Scaffold this active site. Structure first.
Site, PDB file in Angstrom:
ATOM      1  N   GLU A  35     -16.866   6.492  -4.314  1.00 52.21           N
ATOM      2  CA  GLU A  35     -15.688   7.303  -3.984  1.00 52.21           C
ATOM      3  C   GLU A  35     -15.997   8.804  -3.978  1.00 52.21           C
ATOM      4  OE1 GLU A  35     -12.795   6.455  -2.783  1.00 52.21           O
ATOM      5  OE2 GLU A  35     -12.510   4.341  -3.304  1.00 52.21           O
ATOM      6  N   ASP A  48      -3.095  10.443   7.472  1.00 53.62           N
ATOM      7  CA  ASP A  48      -1.646  10.633   7.337  1.00 53.62           C
ATOM      8  C   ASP A  48      -1.234  11.991   6.747  1.00 53.62           C
ATOM      9  OD1 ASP A  48      -2.368  10.185   4.657  1.00 53.62           O
ATOM     10  OD2 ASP A  48      -0.671   8.861   4.256  1.00 53.62           O
ATOM     11  N   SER A  50      -2.176  13.135   3.709  1.00 51.83           N
ATOM     12  CA  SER A  50      -2.407  13.117   2.264  1.00 51.83           C
ATOM     13  C   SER A  50      -3.879  13.412   1.939  1.00 51.83           C
ATOM     14  CB  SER A  50      -1.956  11.783   1.658  1.00 51.83           C
ATOM     15  OG  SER A  50      -2.795  10.719   2.059  1.00 51.83           O
ATOM     16  N   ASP A 101      -0.891  -1.870 -10.589  1.00 50.21           N
ATOM     17  CA  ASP A 101       0.162  -1.868  -9.565  1.00 50.21           C
ATOM     18  C   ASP A 101       0.404  -3.203  -8.849  1.00 50.21           C
ATOM     19  OD1 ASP A 101       2.190  -0.112  -8.494  1.00 50.21           O
ATOM     20  OD2 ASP A 101       1.089  -0.063  -6.594  1.00 50.21           O
TER      21      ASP A 101
END
Ligand SMILES: O=N[O-]
Ligand SMILES: O=N[O-]
Ligand SMILES: O=N[O-]
Ligand SMILES: O=N[O-]
Length: 129
Positions: A35, A48, A50, A101
């Site tokens: 990452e 998008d 973000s 989540d």
């Protein structure tokens, strides 16, 4: 801050990520590698509008406020800049909420594509844990 492999492993363990929601420490080290390359200051823009922030590339779409993702959520109740600190507390605590989540670590695209189903234990090999 750019962490060493075993340095990050130790910090993640201390923060209680080893076997959090059943994901061994190697999974978290592997995810952070792909990452952010272990870099707390890593940022990446999404299509998008973000942005992903920190060692675990946490998205401003849902998890933090960066003041430029209109209409988004701040579920971890933090400024996105907190995710870029040399202290990984905020990143780890937010990661715990993310992984709980419902999708587990599949929330991390790099984990699903590069860590999942691999020998993740190799990421903590040799470390004084
Ligand atoms: O923390 N150096 O592997
Ligand atoms: O924490 N060994 O995957
Ligand atoms: O990320 N809220 O602008
Ligand atoms: O809390 N170790 O960055």
């Amino acid at each position: 801050k750019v962490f060493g492999r075993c340095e990050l492993a130790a910090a993640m363990k201390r923060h209680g990520l080893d076997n959090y929601r059943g994901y061994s420490l190697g999974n978290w080290v592997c995810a952070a590698k792909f990452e952010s390359n272990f870099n707390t200051q890593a940022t990446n823009r999404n299509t998008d509008g973000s942005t992903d922030y920190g060692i675990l590339q946490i998205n401003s779409r849902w998890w933090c406020n960066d003041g430029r993702t209109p209409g988004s959520r701040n579920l971890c109740n933090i400024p996105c800049s907190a995710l870029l600190s040399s202290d990984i507390t905020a990143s780890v605590n937010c990661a715990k909420k993310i992984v709980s989540d419902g999708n587990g670590m599949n929330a991390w695209v790099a984990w699903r594509n590069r860590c999942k189903g691999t020998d993740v234990q190799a990421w903590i090999r040799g470390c004084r844990l």
